């Protein structure tokens, strides 16, 4: 409700905590191109080259995915440049950080 004169103001508060999951890195597999496409066979190296070096545009990018995986976990957690440590005595004016 409201009219030319009204307003609502809180009287008490309540601190709250909520999680927010976020993927950062994904286990990167290193799959090659020949074996998979073709194992150890005499005609493996002759018929494979009939198409060209398409494996160049196949395995080149897969490594890039792998490298970018750790660059994601480097900029996320390695923000601070010095590694700190909490004081031996846990006295923070009443707050409990044991969890």
């Amino acid at each position: 409700a409201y009219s030319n004169n009204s307003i609502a103001i809180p009287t008490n508060f309540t601190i709250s905590v909520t999680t927010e999951i976020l993927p950062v890195s994904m286990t990167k597999t290193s799959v090659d191109c020949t074996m998979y496409i073709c194992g150890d066979s005499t005609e493996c190296s002759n018929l494979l080259l009939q198409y060209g070096s398409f494996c160049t545009q196949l395995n080149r990018a897969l490594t890039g995915i792998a490298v970018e995986q750790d660059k994601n976990t480097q900029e996320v957690f390695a923000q601070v440049k010095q590694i700190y440590k909490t004081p031996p005595i846990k006295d923070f004016g009443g707050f409990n950080f044991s969890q």
């Binding site: 090659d32 020949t34 074996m35 998979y36 080149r60």
Partner: protein, 49 residues
């Protein structure tokens, strides 16, 4: 455990992973080798080879 009335074996992908001799009955599994792809880590050509 191979029941002694089957003939072949194929896990998946038509992979005939069961080869048996007429005289002796033995089971086996077939998988492609380890294998690996390669990539070259080269600094500047003008710097070093």
């Amino acid at each position: 455990k191979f029941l002694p009335f089957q003939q072949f074996g194929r896990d998946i992908a038509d992979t005939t992973d069961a080869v048996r001799d007429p005289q002796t009955l033995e089971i086996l599994d077939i998988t492609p080798c380890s294998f690996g792809g390669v990539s070259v880590i080269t600094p500047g050509t003008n710097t070093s080879n």
